[PDB]
């Protein structure tokens, strides 16, 4: 299934093209010599190269810069740079959420990342500190495009759903600042069926920009998003949260549990999995 694709031209004319498709199966096929494969009843064999990294859905594959490199951004929070002259793959691994959209600058110098939790950062290539940042309200979204990964009937199926008010508050002694609970990203949060919002951002009302971010429950941003069965990992979620009267204290409270599809062997008598 074609999750996305990006073209590259071969040149005042256009002599051939090579176009890259990326699929929710976890694959990235590239097609190499299209115009002369297809211009000339009968045609020769064609065969995409198969470049396979992700397990989840590749969100966006783009040709690079020169056309030497193939960059990629996925669910598993990691931007891959396929080397494409060797076999190798060198990559920026830890993003705060799903890489949802990338584009390559006019010159090859900048990347733009629309991070799936409603932000954007501009990188320079091969320096990989974000020269630019713009974030959004980070909340839970009834998203118009349904998904990229929900095309192939995954074990836990993604449903764009909302199951709780978005836990939040306003700050005395700083009314321009609102605290609100958030996950890794929207899609990773709602995935796994349950809410997983172990995080706070503080956001400005007057100028609707991001201000800051911090953790509440245990977070492992440094980690695999997926348990090896193939499931997004749920992460503890803070039900209630409220602000102090002076503006100095902040009490969160988090609840978490194992999954019913894990428990599965704690059943003794009438013990059921919700019970466990």
């Amino acid at each position: 299934i074609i999750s996305t694709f990006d073209i590259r031209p071969i040149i005042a004319e256009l002599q051939d093209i090579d176009v890259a498709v990326g699929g929710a199966r976890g694959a990235i096929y590239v097609y190499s010599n299209l115009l002369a494969h297809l211009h000339t009843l009968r045609v020769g064999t064609i065969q995409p190269r198969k470049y396979h990294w992700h397990r989840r859905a590749v969100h966006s594959v783009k040709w690079s810069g020169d056309g030497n490199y193939l960059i990629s951004g996925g669910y598993e929070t990691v931007l891959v740079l396929w080397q494409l002259d060797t076999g190798r793959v060198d990559f920026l691994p830890h993003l705060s959420a799903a890489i949802e959209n990338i584009v390559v600058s006019p010159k090859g110098s900048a990347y733009a990342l629309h991070l799936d939790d409603n932000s954007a950062m501009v990188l320079s290539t091969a320096e990989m500190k974000p020269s630019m940042y713009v974030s959004g309200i980070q909340s839970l979204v009834l998203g118009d495009r349904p998904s990229k990964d929900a095309l192939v009937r995954r074990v836990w199926r993604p449903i764009d759903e909302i199951a709780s008010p978005l836990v939040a508050t306003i700050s005395p002694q700083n009314p321009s600042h609102m605290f609100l609970c958030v996950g890794n990203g929207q899609q990773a949060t709602v995935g796994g069926g349950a809410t997983s919002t172990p995080l706070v951002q503080v956001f400005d009302i007057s100028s609707f920009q991001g201000v800051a971010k911090q953790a509440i429950a245990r977070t492992n941003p440094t980690d695999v998003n997926i348990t090896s069965e193939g499931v997004p990992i749920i992460e503890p979620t803070a039900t209630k949260l409220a602000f102090s009267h002076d503006g100095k204290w902040l009490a969160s409270i988090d609840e978490w549990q194992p999954p019913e599809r894990d428990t599965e062997a704690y059943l003794t008598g009438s013990k059921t999995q919700s019970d466990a």
């Binding site: 020169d66 490199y69 080397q83 002259d85 060198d90 090859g108 290539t125 091969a126 320096e127 990989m128």
Partner: protein, 243 residues
């Protein structure tokens, strides 16, 4: 400037560059348009001086004195026919680009699937065309390699490998840019193209035991070797040939 006669030369001593360094000078270069001298010394110090003998109250003023933290500065260089950038690299495993236009200082630190090959970025040379940069892989083992990195995007795009017995002594960019000449120890000279990106040819310095430095220049040399003319090779033993 009169063209110069072949046994004597009217050399004039001028005013010293005033500020001295605090260890042995490691890299010099001139800005390719304006007579402005980059010196760079092991004491992590880069000096930009303007060339002016008749300056006052001090001759050859220092425009700036820029320190780099934590590294040495073994080799600095000017980049670009326009002399756009200044690129400098010490022993430490990163290196830096300095964009004089707007004065940003980007710290480059990654070589895209060779990062374990290069534990240093000490030696490097930039194309006169100013698009490519060549780093040397500190991994000797029978033959040394030098990576080619676009300064378009500081990305790995090529890796020329030459045979040797210790790796690559020195190398230089041909004047067009299309290829680069690699003088590896035990006197092998590879000439390794870029447009083909495979080795053009191999030949030998006339029996020198260990080559240490080479360099390359001149005009109206053969165009398919880039069009540079004289090539100099310096041994360990001290004898230096010109071809």
């Amino acid at each position: 400037r009169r063209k110069l006669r072949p046994e004597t030369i009217d050399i004039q001593r001028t005013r010293d560059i005033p500020d001295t360094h605090k260890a042995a000078i490691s890299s010099l270069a001139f800005h390719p348009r304006y007579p402005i001298l980059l010196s760079s010394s092991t004491s992590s110090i880069m000096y930009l001086h303007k060339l002016d003998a008749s300056a006052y109250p001090t001759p050859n003023p220092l425009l700036t004195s820029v320190h780099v933290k934590r590294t040495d500065l073994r080799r600095a260089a000017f980049v670009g026919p326009d002399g756009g950038e200044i690129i400098f690299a010490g022993r430490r495993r990163y290196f830096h680009c300095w964009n004089l236009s707007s004065g940003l200082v980007k710290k480059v630190s990654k070589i895209q699937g060779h990062q374990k090959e290069q534990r240093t970025m000490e030696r490097f040379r930039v194309s006169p065309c100013g698009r490519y940069m060549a780093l040397v892989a500190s991994d000797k083992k029978g033959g040394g390699m030098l990576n080619i990195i676009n300064v378009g995007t500081m990305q790995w795009i090529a890796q020329a490998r030459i045979d040797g017995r210790h790796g690559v002594a020195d190398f230089a960019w041909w004047s067009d840019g299309n290829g680069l000449t690699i003088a590896g120890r035990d006197g092998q000279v590879t000439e390794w193209s870029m447009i083909t990106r495979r080795t053009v040819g191999i030949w030998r310095d006339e029996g020198s035991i260990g080559g240490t430095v080479m360099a390359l220049g001149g005009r109206n040399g053969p165009a398919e070797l880039g069009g540079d003319r004289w090539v100099a090779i310096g041994s360990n033993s001290g004898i230096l040939n010109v071809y």
